[PDB]
Amino acid sequence: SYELTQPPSVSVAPGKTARITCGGNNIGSKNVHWYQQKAGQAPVVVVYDYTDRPSGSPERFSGSKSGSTATLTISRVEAGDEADYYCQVWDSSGDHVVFGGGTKLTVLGQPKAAPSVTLFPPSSEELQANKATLVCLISDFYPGAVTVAWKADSSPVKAGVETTTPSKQSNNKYAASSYLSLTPEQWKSHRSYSCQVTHEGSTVEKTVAPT
Amino acid sequence: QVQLQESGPGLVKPSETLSLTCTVSGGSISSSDYYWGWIRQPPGKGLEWIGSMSYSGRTYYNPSLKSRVTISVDTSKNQFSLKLSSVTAADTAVYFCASHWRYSGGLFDYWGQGTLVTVSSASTKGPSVFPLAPSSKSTSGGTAALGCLVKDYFPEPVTVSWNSGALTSGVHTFPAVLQSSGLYSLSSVVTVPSSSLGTQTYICNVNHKPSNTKVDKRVEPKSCDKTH
Structure with missing residues (x-):
């Protein structure tokens, strides 16, 4: 039913102010709370949007509201503020709880790096075994947050896809991987397939064909 | 003030039924001021709320899940539980319990740590x-x-x-x-x-x-x- 829209990733230089947005149909008329969550932990609420009295949050955290976009503003941002932030509401349509999809806030602590992409088609071995996997390797990137779209009959494929979440590598950048699970004939049909890696409003694309 | 901890089975065979339990302290399950919630998070993905139960009787559900979820409380043990039925690979997730503070439209102010549940043979x-x-x-x-x-x-x-x-x-x-x-x-x-x-x-x-x-x-x- 009711949806909340959050940017998947957001990066700030330290000391700068981070703005994290949460879009819902007149979200402005409802209580809007925020949760911080660091890796391997439970969420902590960081914006108690108390009805009829001031908010609760640590210093420099503040939830703002406007028509159909709530905002979580963190000023003079600090490394330890790096986390996934989730907004949460009550859709009393309805009678249920709604979260946004979460946002990795990255506090920039090293130079930005685009992804080094590498697509591998199914191996002849795997094909002979009556299977087929496409393998998209993504490496040497910072901040660690990509989104991956597969398609290329240019039509969005989804449905076959599994994607890892980024991880620190040897050289302190991030690495991630995606897979498009096919069957040999599915691979055979379409002329092409593409793995397209979005990274901070940029896009590195690669394509393969059963040549 | 409120503390929560989940108990679960780690691995659950497909088609079967997941059952978790949560232990509370620092508040009574019976408070009119609280609901009691289950929230899951598949690895490296987002938070999905499952359901919340009040002592009073009211129980709220995730619409795509209502069909298969059951929630129960036990004032004697100051515990509450979940059962998720006909469980599939897409149910592998960390399952949290949280206190569901009934006011300001509802928020989860106190959380258990996770418990990972993998559904697989x-x-x-x-x-x-x-x-x-x-x-x-x-x-x-x-x-x-x-x-x-x-x-x-x-x-x-x-x-x-x-x-x-x-x-x-x-x-x-x-x-x-x-x-x-x-x-x-x-x-x-x-x-x-x-x-x-x-x-x-x-x-x-x-x-x-x-x-x-x-x-x-x-x-x-x-x-x-x-x-x-």
């Missing part, structure tokens, strides 16, 4: 590994790319050496995806001298202790791009 399965051959494309000049695909195994973990540890320069071994079927896949890459591709040998050494298998896999260039 208890069975154990070693991996099929295939070569990720180097291409004319897998080269950015001098540096070529090549690797091994380690497909469909269970459970974690897997260890991937190259040649036999004899090659460790320029090797990133990726984390594994759990993929709706119950199985894991991972890849490991290695950058090499493209000039000597046709004279060398590059071998994956994949070990999956939970099955005592250990696969060597030689990755030769694409035969039709051979250099003679």
Whole structure:
């Protein structure tokens, strides 16, 4: 039913102010709370949007509201503020709880790096075994947050896809991987397939064909 | 003030029924001021609320889940529970319990730590590994790319050496995806001298202790791009 829209990733230089947005149909008329969550932990609420009295949050955290976009503003941002932030509401349509999809806030602590992409088609071995996997390797990137779209009959494929979440590598950048699970004939049909890696409003694309 | 801890089974066989329990202290389950909630989070994805129950009787549900979820409280033990039925690979997730503070439209102010629940057969399965051959494309000049695909195994973990540890320069071994079927896949890459591709040998050494298998896999260039 009711949806909340959050940017998947957001990066700030330290000391700068981070703005994290949460879009819902007149979200402005409802209580809007925020949760911080660091890796391997439970969420902590960081914006108690108390009805009829001031908010609760640590210093420099503040939830703002406007028509159909709530905002979580963190000023003079600090490394330890790096986390996934989730907004949460009550859709009393309805009678249920709604979260946004979460946002990795990255506090920039090293130079930005685009992804080094590498697509591998199914191996002849795997094909002979009556299977087929496409393998998209993504490496040497910072901040660690990509989104991956597969398609290329240019039509969005989804449905076959599994994607890892980024991880620190040897050289302190991030690495991630995606897979498009096919069957040999599915691979055979379409002329092409593409793995397209979005990274901070940029896009590195690669394509393969059963040549 | 409120503290919560979940108890669960770790692994649950497909089609069957997940049952968790939560223990509370620092408030009574019976407070009119609280609801009691279950929230799950599949690895590296987002938070999904499951349901919330009041002592009074009211119970709120995730619409796409109402069908299969059951929630219960026990004032005597100051506990509450969840049951998720006809459980599938897509139910593998960390399950949190939280106190559901009834005011300001509802928020979860106090959380358990997680409990991971994997839904999969208890069975154990070693991996099929295939070569990720180097291409004319897998080269950015001098540096070529090549690797091994380690497909469909269970459970974690897997260890991937190259040649036999004899090659460790320029090797990133990726984390594994759990993929709706119950199985894991991972890849490991290695950058090499493209000039000597046709004279060398590059071998994956994949070990999956939970099955005592250990696969060597030689990755030769694409035969039709051979250099003679």
